[PDB]
Amino acid sequence: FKHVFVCVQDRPPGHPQGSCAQRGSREVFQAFMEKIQTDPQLFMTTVITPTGCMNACMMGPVVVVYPDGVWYGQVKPEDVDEIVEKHLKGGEPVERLVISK
Protein backbone atom coordinates (compact mmCIF):
# COMPACT_ATOMS: atom_id res chain seq x y z
CA PHE A 1 0.00 0.00 0.00
CA LYS A 2 1.41 3.43 -0.85
CA HIS A 3 0.04 6.88 -0.06
CA VAL A 4 1.25 9.67 -2.32
CA PHE A 5 0.88 13.29 -1.24
CA VAL A 6 1.26 16.08 -3.81
CA CYS A 7 1.53 19.65 -2.58
CA VAL A 8 -0.93 21.76 -4.68
CA GLN A 9 -0.51 24.89 -2.63
CA ASP A 10 -0.88 28.14 -4.51
CA ARG A 11 0.35 31.53 -3.30
CA PRO A 12 0.16 35.05 -4.72
CA PRO A 13 3.09 36.27 -6.98
CA GLY A 14 5.14 38.05 -4.42
CA HIS A 15 5.69 35.15 -2.08
CA PRO A 16 9.50 34.74 -2.10
CA GLN A 17 9.60 30.92 -2.20
CA GLY A 18 6.86 30.62 -4.84
CA SER A 19 4.50 27.66 -4.52
CA CYS A 20 4.20 24.18 -5.91
CA ALA A 21 1.09 25.10 -7.89
CA GLN A 22 3.04 27.89 -9.62
CA ARG A 23 5.70 25.32 -10.47
CA GLY A 24 3.15 23.00 -12.15
CA SER A 25 2.11 20.77 -9.32
CA ARG A 26 -1.64 20.67 -10.07
CA GLU A 27 -0.67 18.93 -13.33
CA VAL A 28 1.57 16.52 -11.41
CA PHE A 29 -1.33 15.67 -9.09
CA GLN A 30 -3.76 15.15 -11.99
CA ALA A 31 -1.19 12.88 -13.71
CA PHE A 32 -0.86 10.72 -10.64
CA MET A 33 -4.65 10.51 -10.26
CA GLU A 34 -5.08 9.43 -13.92
CA LYS A 35 -2.38 6.76 -13.69
CA ILE A 36 -3.62 5.23 -10.48
CA GLN A 37 -7.32 5.13 -11.58
CA THR A 38 -6.47 3.40 -14.85
CA ASP A 39 -3.97 0.86 -13.54
CA PRO A 40 -5.54 -2.30 -12.18
CA GLN A 41 -2.67 -3.18 -9.85
CA LEU A 42 -2.34 0.32 -8.44
CA PHE A 43 -5.97 1.24 -8.11
CA MET A 44 -6.46 -1.07 -5.18
CA THR A 45 -3.20 -0.32 -3.30
CA THR A 46 -2.47 3.38 -3.85
CA VAL A 47 -3.99 6.62 -2.67
CA ILE A 48 -3.18 10.07 -4.15
CA THR A 49 -3.90 13.05 -1.98
CA PRO A 50 -3.50 16.75 -2.75
CA THR A 51 -2.10 18.84 0.12
CA GLY A 52 -1.17 22.28 1.31
CA CYS A 53 2.47 23.36 1.68
CA MET A 54 4.85 20.73 3.12
CA ASN A 55 7.61 23.21 3.80
CA ALA A 56 10.05 22.43 0.98
CA CYS A 57 8.89 25.04 -1.42
CA MET A 58 12.08 25.89 -3.20
CA MET A 59 12.21 22.21 -4.24
CA GLY A 60 8.68 22.07 -5.66
CA PRO A 61 6.69 20.43 -6.89
CA VAL A 62 7.06 18.34 -3.74
CA VAL A 63 5.61 14.79 -3.64
CA VAL A 64 5.97 12.53 -0.58
CA VAL A 65 5.33 8.76 -0.62
CA TYR A 66 4.33 7.05 2.62
CA PRO A 67 4.86 4.94 4.59
CA ASP A 68 8.28 4.79 2.86
CA GLY A 69 8.91 8.45 3.75
CA VAL A 70 10.41 9.23 0.35
CA TRP A 71 10.30 12.95 -0.54
CA TYR A 72 10.64 14.02 -4.13
CA GLY A 73 11.39 17.49 -5.37
CA GLN A 74 11.18 19.26 -8.72
CA VAL A 75 8.70 16.76 -10.06
CA LYS A 76 7.44 17.51 -13.59
CA PRO A 77 4.24 15.92 -14.94
CA GLU A 78 6.49 13.98 -17.37
CA ASP A 79 8.21 12.37 -14.41
CA VAL A 80 5.01 10.92 -12.98
CA ASP A 81 5.11 7.85 -15.20
CA GLU A 82 8.60 7.00 -13.99
CA ILE A 83 7.67 7.35 -10.34
CA VAL A 84 4.58 5.22 -10.86
CA GLU A 85 6.49 2.50 -12.70
CA LYS A 86 9.71 2.35 -10.84
CA HIS A 87 8.62 3.25 -7.31
CA LEU A 88 4.88 2.78 -6.83
CA LYS A 89 4.84 -0.51 -8.70
CA GLY A 90 8.57 -1.37 -8.69
CA GLY A 91 9.54 -0.53 -5.14
CA GLU A 92 12.57 1.55 -6.19
CA PRO A 93 12.47 5.34 -5.54
CA VAL A 94 13.47 7.48 -8.51
CA GLU A 95 16.83 8.52 -7.19
CA ARG A 96 17.31 11.50 -9.48
CA LEU A 97 14.32 13.31 -7.91
CA VAL A 98 14.66 12.28 -4.25
CA ILE A 99 15.33 15.08 -1.83
CA SER A 100 14.90 12.97 1.35
CA LYS A 101 14.13 9.52 2.71
Binding site for ligand FES (CB under 6 A): 7, 9, 19-20, 53-57, 60, 62
Contacts of 100 (CB under 8 A, 6+ apart): 69, 70, 71
Rule CB under 8 A: say whether 91 interacts with its own copies: no
- Bridge partners, residue 65, by sequence: 4, 70
Report yes or no: 82 and 68 within 8 Å, Cβ to Cβ: no
Longest Cα separation, the chain: 42
**Residues 94, 90, 6, 32: is their CA dihedral positive or negative?**
positive
- Scan residues 8-37 and list those touching its own copies (CB under 8 A): 8
- Scan residues 47-86 and list those touching its own copies (CB under 8 A): 47, 49-55, 64, 66-69
7 is in an annotated binding site: yes
Report yes or no: 76 and 12 within 8 Å, Cβ to Cβ: no
**Residue 62 binds which one of its own copies, Zn ion, ligand FES, none, with CB within 5 to 8 A depending on kind?**
ligand FES
**Residue 20 binds which one of its own copies, Zn ion, ligand FES, none, with CB within 5 to 8 A depending on kind?**
ligand FES
Q: For ligand FES, give the closer residue by CB, 27 or 85.
A: 27
**Residue ranges in contact with Zn ion by CB under 5 A:** 10, 15, 81
